[PDB]
C-alpha cells in the first residue's frame, strides 16, 4: 500500500536499452530517508 513503483524498459536507438522507473508515496506528509535496490538481467 505504501509505494506506488513503476519499472519499464526501452530500447534506444550491445543493444543499450534504457531504464526508467518511477515512484510515489501513498499517504499525507513527506516520507523520510528511503532505500532502493536494483538488479540487471545476467
Known amino acids: 500500500n505504501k509505494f506506488d513503483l513503476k519499472v519499464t524498459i526501452k530500447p534506444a536507438p550491445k ?10 508515496y501513498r499517504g499525507d506528509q513527506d516520507a523520510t530517508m528511503s532505500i ?6 545476467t
Not at 15 to 24: A, F, G, K, S
Not at 36 to 41: G, K, P, R, V, Y
Open 36 to 41: 532502493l535496490d536494483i538488479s540487471m538481467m
Open 15 to 24: 543493444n543499450t536499452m534504457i531504464l526508467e522507473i518511477c515512484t510515489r
